[PDB]
PDB file of C-alpha atoms and ligand atoms in Angstrom:
ATOM      1  CA  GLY A1035    -104.507  60.747 -36.215  1.00  0.00           C
ATOM      2  CA  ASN A1036    -108.026  60.456 -37.643  1.00  0.00           C
ATOM      3  CA  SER A1037    -107.326  64.101 -38.546  1.00  0.00           C
ATOM      4  CA  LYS A1038    -107.514  65.240 -34.901  1.00  0.00           C
ATOM      5  CA  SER A1039    -104.924  62.984 -33.203  1.00  0.00           C
ATOM      6  CA  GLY A1040    -105.420  59.253 -32.668  1.00  0.00           C
ATOM      7  CA  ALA A1041    -103.572  57.365 -35.419  1.00  0.00           C
ATOM      8  CA  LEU A1042    -101.130  56.288 -32.758  1.00  0.00           C
ATOM      9  CA  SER A1043    -103.291  53.157 -32.590  1.00  0.00           C
ATOM     10  CA  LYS A1044    -102.086  52.089 -36.054  1.00  0.00           C
ATOM     11  CA  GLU A1045     -98.478  51.986 -34.916  1.00  0.00           C
ATOM     12  CA  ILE A1046     -99.609  49.945 -31.900  1.00  0.00           C
ATOM     13  CA  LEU A1047    -101.547  47.414 -34.001  1.00  0.00           C
ATOM     14  CA  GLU A1048     -98.623  47.131 -36.412  1.00  0.00           C
ATOM     15  CA  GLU A1049     -96.014  46.506 -33.710  1.00  0.00           C
ATOM     16  CA  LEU A1050     -98.284  44.092 -31.859  1.00  0.00           C
ATOM     17  CA  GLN A1051    -100.276  42.460 -34.667  1.00  0.00           C
ATOM     18  CA  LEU A1052    -102.660  39.637 -33.766  1.00  0.00           C
ATOM     19  CA  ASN A1053    -101.270  39.995 -30.223  1.00  0.00           C
ATOM     20  CA  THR A1054    -103.451  43.095 -29.809  1.00  0.00           C
ATOM     21  CA  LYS A1055    -106.523  42.818 -27.553  1.00  0.00           C
ATOM     22  CA  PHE A1056    -107.880  45.991 -29.083  1.00  0.00           C
ATOM     23  CA  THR A1057    -109.138  47.413 -32.374  1.00  0.00           C
ATOM     24  CA  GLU A1058    -107.943  50.877 -33.403  1.00  0.00           C
ATOM     25  CA  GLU A1059    -111.231  52.472 -32.381  1.00  0.00           C
ATOM     26  CA  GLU A1060    -111.000  50.974 -28.893  1.00  0.00           C
ATOM     27  CA  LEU A1061    -107.341  51.980 -28.614  1.00  0.00           C
ATOM     28  CA  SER A1062    -108.388  55.543 -29.463  1.00  0.00           C
ATOM     29  CA  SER A1063    -111.022  55.381 -26.733  1.00  0.00           C
ATOM     30  CA  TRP A1064    -108.509  54.075 -24.191  1.00  0.00           C
ATOM     31  CA  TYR A1065    -106.208  56.817 -25.508  1.00  0.00           C
ATOM     32  CA  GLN A1066    -108.869  59.499 -24.965  1.00  0.00           C
ATOM     33  CA  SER A1067    -109.274  58.271 -21.398  1.00  0.00           C
ATOM     34  CA  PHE A1068    -105.498  57.993 -21.038  1.00  0.00           C
ATOM     35  CA  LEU A1069    -105.131  61.675 -21.986  1.00  0.00           C
ATOM     36  CA  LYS A1070    -107.787  62.799 -19.505  1.00  0.00           C
ATOM     37  CA  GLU A1071    -105.579  61.321 -16.788  1.00  0.00           C
ATOM     38  CA  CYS A1072    -102.180  62.005 -18.395  1.00  0.00           C
ATOM     39  CA  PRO A1073    -102.633  65.114 -20.606  1.00  0.00           C
ATOM     40  CA  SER A1074     -99.105  64.862 -22.002  1.00  0.00           C
ATOM     41  CA  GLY A1075     -99.617  61.312 -23.218  1.00  0.00           C
ATOM     42  CA  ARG A1076     -96.437  60.323 -21.401  1.00  0.00           C
ATOM     43  CA  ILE A1077     -96.065  58.261 -18.256  1.00  0.00           C
ATOM     44  CA  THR A1078     -93.074  58.206 -15.920  1.00  0.00           C
ATOM     45  CA  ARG A1079     -91.489  55.132 -14.377  1.00  0.00           C
ATOM     46  CA  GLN A1080     -92.882  55.988 -10.933  1.00  0.00           C
ATOM     47  CA  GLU A1081     -96.393  56.268 -12.390  1.00  0.00           C
ATOM     48  CA  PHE A1082     -95.978  53.020 -14.323  1.00  0.00           C
ATOM     49  CA  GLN A1083     -94.796  51.327 -11.119  1.00  0.00           C
ATOM     50  CA  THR A1084     -97.950  52.514  -9.385  1.00  0.00           C
ATOM     51  CA  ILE A1085    -100.066  50.586 -11.867  1.00  0.00           C
ATOM     52  CA  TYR A1086     -98.391  47.334 -10.847  1.00  0.00           C
ATOM     53  CA  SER A1087     -98.296  48.190  -7.146  1.00  0.00           C
ATOM     54  CA  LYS A1088    -102.059  48.689  -7.332  1.00  0.00           C
ATOM     55  CA  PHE A1089    -102.847  45.562  -9.285  1.00  0.00           C
ATOM     56  CA  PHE A1090    -100.480  43.114  -7.613  1.00  0.00           C
ATOM     57  CA  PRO A1091    -101.229  43.803  -3.897  1.00  0.00           C
ATOM     58  CA  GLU A1092    -100.165  40.279  -3.021  1.00  0.00           C
ATOM     59  CA  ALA A1093     -96.667  40.827  -4.418  1.00  0.00           C
ATOM     60  CA  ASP A1094     -93.716  43.257  -4.453  1.00  0.00           C
ATOM     61  CA  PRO A1095     -93.815  44.452  -8.108  1.00  0.00           C
ATOM     62  CA  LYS A1096     -91.577  47.516  -7.945  1.00  0.00           C
ATOM     63  CA  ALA A1097     -88.448  45.948  -9.452  1.00  0.00           C
ATOM     64  CA  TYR A1098     -90.531  44.075 -12.021  1.00  0.00           C
ATOM     65  CA  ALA A1099     -92.377  47.197 -13.152  1.00  0.00           C
ATOM     66  CA  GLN A1100     -89.074  49.083 -13.399  1.00  0.00           C
ATOM     67  CA  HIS A1101     -87.489  46.417 -15.625  1.00  0.00           C
ATOM     68  CA  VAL A1102     -90.572  46.294 -17.844  1.00  0.00           C
ATOM     69  CA  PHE A1103     -90.550  50.080 -18.154  1.00  0.00           C
ATOM     70  CA  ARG A1104     -86.842  49.986 -19.031  1.00  0.00           C
ATOM     71  CA  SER A1105     -87.215  47.204 -21.620  1.00  0.00           C
ATOM     72  CA  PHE A1106     -88.399  49.933 -23.960  1.00  0.00           C
ATOM     73  CA  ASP A1107     -84.899  51.533 -24.155  1.00  0.00           C
ATOM     74  CA  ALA A1108     -82.826  50.514 -21.087  1.00  0.00           C
ATOM     75  CA  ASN A1109     -83.501  53.900 -19.478  1.00  0.00           C
ATOM     76  CA  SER A1110     -85.026  54.480 -16.013  1.00  0.00           C
ATOM     77  CA  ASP A1111     -85.491  58.195 -16.614  1.00  0.00           C
ATOM     78  CA  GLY A1112     -87.939  59.736 -19.045  1.00  0.00           C
ATOM     79  CA  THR A1113     -91.312  58.308 -19.960  1.00  0.00           C
ATOM     80  CA  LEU A1114     -93.256  55.808 -22.036  1.00  0.00           C
ATOM     81  CA  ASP A1115     -95.730  57.073 -24.600  1.00  0.00           C
ATOM     82  CA  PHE A1116     -99.192  55.541 -24.942  1.00  0.00           C
ATOM     83  CA  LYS A1117     -97.928  53.023 -27.476  1.00  0.00           C
ATOM     84  CA  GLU A1118     -95.180  51.622 -25.256  1.00  0.00           C
ATOM     85  CA  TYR A1119     -97.512  51.664 -22.252  1.00  0.00           C
ATOM     86  CA  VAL A1120    -100.149  49.583 -24.089  1.00  0.00           C
ATOM     87  CA  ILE A1121     -97.507  47.209 -25.413  1.00  0.00           C
ATOM     88  CA  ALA A1122     -95.982  46.867 -21.927  1.00  0.00           C
ATOM     89  CA  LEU A1123     -99.314  45.856 -20.395  1.00  0.00           C
ATOM     90  CA  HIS A1124     -99.748  43.347 -23.205  1.00  0.00           C
ATOM     91  CA  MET A1125     -96.321  41.833 -22.565  1.00  0.00           C
ATOM     92  CA  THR A1126     -97.017  41.299 -18.871  1.00  0.00           C
ATOM     93  CA  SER A1127    -100.669  40.301 -19.039  1.00  0.00           C
ATOM     94  CA  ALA A1128    -102.019  39.178 -22.427  1.00  0.00           C
ATOM     95  CA  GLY A1129    -101.371  36.886 -25.360  1.00  0.00           C
ATOM     96  CA  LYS A1130     -98.944  34.034 -25.965  1.00  0.00           C
ATOM     97  CA  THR A1131     -95.331  33.990 -24.775  1.00  0.00           C
ATOM     98  CA  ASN A1132     -93.890  32.679 -28.054  1.00  0.00           C
ATOM     99  CA  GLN A1133     -94.880  35.895 -29.758  1.00  0.00           C
ATOM    100  CA  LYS A1134     -93.073  37.880 -27.059  1.00  0.00           C
ATOM    101  CA  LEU A1135     -89.578  36.336 -27.296  1.00  0.00           C
ATOM    102  CA  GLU A1136     -87.856  39.303 -28.961  1.00  0.00           C
ATOM    103  CA  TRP A1137     -89.254  41.593 -26.283  1.00  0.00           C
ATOM    104  CA  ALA A1138     -88.332  39.050 -23.619  1.00  0.00           C
ATOM    105  CA  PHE A1139     -84.721  39.342 -24.764  1.00  0.00           C
ATOM    106  CA  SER A1140     -84.848  43.121 -24.280  1.00  0.00           C
ATOM    107  CA  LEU A1141     -86.287  42.559 -20.811  1.00  0.00           C
ATOM    108  CA  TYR A1142     -83.452  40.209 -19.847  1.00  0.00           C
ATOM    109  CA  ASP A1143     -80.717  42.364 -21.396  1.00  0.00           C
ATOM    110  CA  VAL A1144     -80.837  44.770 -18.432  1.00  0.00           C
ATOM    111  CA  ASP A1145     -77.981  47.093 -19.467  1.00  0.00           C
ATOM    112  CA  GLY A1146     -79.008  46.877 -23.112  1.00  0.00           C
ATOM    113  CA  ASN A1147     -75.518  46.052 -24.347  1.00  0.00           C
ATOM    114  CA  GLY A1148     -76.836  43.455 -26.793  1.00  0.00           C
ATOM    115  CA  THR A1149     -76.290  40.268 -24.805  1.00  0.00           C
ATOM    116  CA  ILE A1150     -77.514  38.706 -21.593  1.00  0.00           C
ATOM    117  CA  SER A1151     -75.169  38.007 -18.726  1.00  0.00           C
ATOM    118  CA  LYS A1152     -75.616  35.549 -15.886  1.00  0.00           C
ATOM    119  CA  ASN A1153     -76.214  38.369 -13.420  1.00  0.00           C
ATOM    120  CA  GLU A1154     -78.900  39.920 -15.612  1.00  0.00           C
ATOM    121  CA  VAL A1155     -80.781  36.642 -15.676  1.00  0.00           C
ATOM    122  CA  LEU A1156     -80.669  36.604 -11.866  1.00  0.00           C
ATOM    123  CA  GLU A1157     -81.827  40.220 -11.621  1.00  0.00           C
ATOM    124  CA  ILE A1158     -84.858  39.586 -13.834  1.00  0.00           C
ATOM    125  CA  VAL A1159     -85.643  36.137 -12.396  1.00  0.00           C
ATOM    126  CA  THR A1160     -85.583  37.750  -8.936  1.00  0.00           C
ATOM    127  CA  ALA A1161     -87.912  40.572  -9.990  1.00  0.00           C
ATOM    128  CA  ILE A1162     -90.358  38.050 -11.485  1.00  0.00           C
ATOM    129  CA  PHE A1163     -90.030  35.797  -8.422  1.00  0.00           C
ATOM    130  CA  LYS A1164     -91.227  38.716  -6.274  1.00  0.00           C
ATOM    131  CA  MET A1165     -94.415  38.780  -8.357  1.00  0.00           C
ATOM    132  CA  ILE A1166     -95.360  35.384  -6.904  1.00  0.00           C
ATOM    133  CA  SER A1167     -97.313  35.578  -3.649  1.00  0.00           C
ATOM    134  CA  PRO A1168     -95.555  33.789  -0.744  1.00  0.00           C
ATOM    135  CA  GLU A1169     -98.578  31.476  -0.715  1.00  0.00           C
ATOM    136  CA  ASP A1170     -97.738  30.076  -4.181  1.00  0.00           C
ATOM    137  CA  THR A1171     -93.943  29.588  -3.918  1.00  0.00           C
ATOM    138  CA  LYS A1172     -94.517  26.420  -1.871  1.00  0.00           C
ATOM    139  CA  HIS A1173     -96.040  24.698  -4.921  1.00  0.00           C
ATOM    140  CA  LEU A1174     -92.782  25.377  -6.786  1.00  0.00           C
ATOM    141  CA  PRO A1175     -90.313  22.546  -7.542  1.00  0.00           C
ATOM    142  CA  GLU A1176     -87.437  22.259  -5.058  1.00  0.00           C
ATOM    143  CA  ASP A1177     -84.845  23.002  -7.729  1.00  0.00           C
ATOM    144  CA  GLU A1178     -86.844  25.993  -8.957  1.00  0.00           C
ATOM    145  CA  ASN A1179     -88.107  27.492  -5.691  1.00  0.00           C
ATOM    146  CA  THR A1180     -85.626  30.372  -5.202  1.00  0.00           C
ATOM    147  CA  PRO A1181     -84.300  33.058  -7.589  1.00  0.00           C
ATOM    148  CA  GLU A1182     -80.789  31.587  -7.379  1.00  0.00           C
ATOM    149  CA  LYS A1183     -81.934  28.086  -8.302  1.00  0.00           C
ATOM    150  CA  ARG A1184     -84.136  29.250 -11.175  1.00  0.00           C
ATOM    151  CA  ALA A1185     -81.522  31.607 -12.613  1.00  0.00           C
ATOM    152  CA  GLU A1186     -78.759  29.000 -12.486  1.00  0.00           C
ATOM    153  CA  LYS A1187     -81.014  26.402 -14.085  1.00  0.00           C
ATOM    154  CA  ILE A1188     -81.682  28.814 -16.957  1.00  0.00           C
ATOM    155  CA  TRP A1189     -77.967  29.474 -17.354  1.00  0.00           C
ATOM    156  CA  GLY A1190     -77.316  25.742 -17.287  1.00  0.00           C
ATOM    157  CA  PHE A1191     -79.950  25.034 -19.921  1.00  0.00           C
ATOM    158  CA  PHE A1192     -78.134  27.521 -22.131  1.00  0.00           C
ATOM    159  CA  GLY A1193     -74.931  25.619 -21.380  1.00  0.00           C
ATOM    160  CA  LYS A1194     -73.170  28.784 -20.303  1.00  0.00           C
ATOM    161  CA  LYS A1195     -70.139  29.388 -18.106  1.00  0.00           C
ATOM    162  CA  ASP A1196     -70.182  32.114 -15.465  1.00  0.00           C
ATOM    163  CA  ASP A1197     -68.812  34.789 -17.789  1.00  0.00           C
ATOM    164  CA  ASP A1198     -70.339  33.810 -21.113  1.00  0.00           C
ATOM    165  CA  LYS A1199     -72.649  36.127 -23.068  1.00  0.00           C
ATOM    166  CA  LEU A1200     -76.079  34.985 -24.233  1.00  0.00           C
ATOM    167  CA  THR A1201     -77.152  36.273 -27.654  1.00  0.00           C
ATOM    168  CA  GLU A1202     -80.642  36.995 -28.946  1.00  0.00           C
ATOM    169  CA  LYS A1203     -80.257  34.282 -31.580  1.00  0.00           C
ATOM    170  CA  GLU A1204     -79.637  31.633 -28.922  1.00  0.00           C
ATOM    171  CA  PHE A1205     -82.137  33.086 -26.447  1.00  0.00           C
ATOM    172  CA  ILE A1206     -84.893  32.734 -29.043  1.00  0.00           C
ATOM    173  CA  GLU A1207     -83.796  29.247 -30.106  1.00  0.00           C
ATOM    174  CA  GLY A1208     -83.716  28.019 -26.522  1.00  0.00           C
ATOM    175  CA  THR A1209     -86.930  29.634 -25.352  1.00  0.00           C
ATOM    176  CA  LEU A1210     -88.698  28.083 -28.362  1.00  0.00           C
ATOM    177  CA  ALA A1211     -87.083  24.636 -28.344  1.00  0.00           C
ATOM    178  CA  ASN A1212     -86.579  23.897 -24.645  1.00  0.00           C
ATOM    179  CA  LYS A1213     -89.895  24.249 -22.849  1.00  0.00           C
ATOM    180  CA  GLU A1214     -88.127  24.115 -19.473  1.00  0.00           C
ATOM    181  CA  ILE A1215     -86.268  27.314 -20.371  1.00  0.00           C
ATOM    182  CA  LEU A1216     -89.622  28.816 -21.348  1.00  0.00           C
ATOM    183  CA  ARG A1217     -91.116  27.772 -17.996  1.00  0.00           C
ATOM    184  CA  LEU A1218     -88.218  29.342 -16.101  1.00  0.00           C
ATOM    185  CA  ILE A1219     -87.906  32.603 -18.025  1.00  0.00           C
ATOM    186  CA  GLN A1220     -91.695  33.101 -17.988  1.00  0.00           C
ATOM    187  CA  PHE A1221     -92.432  36.703 -16.976  1.00  0.00           C
ATOM    188  CA  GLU A1222     -96.232  36.855 -16.970  1.00  0.00           C
ATOM    189  CA  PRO A1223     -97.255  36.497 -13.308  1.00  0.00           C
ATOM    190  CA  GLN A1224    -100.505  34.635 -14.075  1.00  0.00           C
ATOM    191  CA  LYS A1225     -98.679  32.113 -16.296  1.00  0.00           C
ATOM    192  CA  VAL A1226     -96.057  31.400 -13.678  1.00  0.00           C
ATOM    193  CA  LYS A1227     -98.854  30.912 -11.126  1.00  0.00           C
ATOM    194  CA  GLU A1228    -101.059  28.736 -13.323  1.00  0.00           C
ATOM    195  CA  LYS A1229     -98.204  26.373 -14.092  1.00  0.00           C
ATOM    196  CA  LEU A1230     -97.228  26.661 -10.436  1.00  0.00           C
ATOM    197  CA  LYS A1231    -100.513  24.900  -9.616  1.00  0.00           C
ATOM    198  CA  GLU A1232    -100.997  22.255 -12.252  1.00  0.00           C
ATOM    199  CA  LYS A1233     -98.967  19.635 -14.018  1.00  0.00           C
ATOM    200  CA  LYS A1234     -99.147  16.142 -12.553  1.00  0.00           C
ATOM    201  CA  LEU A1235     -98.677  14.255  -9.258  1.00  0.00           C
TER     202      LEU A1235
HETATM  203 CA1   CA B1654     -76.543  42.932 -21.126  1.00  0.00          CA
END
């Protein structure tokens, strides 16, 4: 930790790699500031939720923030340490999606039982949908303009029956190969929005 706490930034860089938006020295600085506000270096789910409530005033981010917080162990109780908190912000707001597919699986596997069910896709798709301001949902395709439609389209693209289980192997294959699945599972609010106002006539 430099010798006086701080080498937690190495673990972060390792687990995030090129995806990092920070050097270890900057992470330590953010960490020093983090500790002035959260002395224990831990952050609860309620506190994490507040971050998103504050920075997404146009949306209803509570469910979304809770699922993101849980992705780091499928637990609503407890806390996230600085490392998981930095990685969580990166997953929702920075970098490329294709480097986040393994984490995306953990996000979609709500109960953490190793596979994704149809209902879990709907729960997450709904949470992400609520991150879109009412103003933008009108630019959304007819067959992708409600949580139900989006979630069923994703399930259909995976060629699944109502009670089938979706594995990580297939989730990664499909999110990489089929760009429509990518578009529909997309969890970064800005990316959903920016594609939600582009394309072609
Ligand atoms: Ca599951």
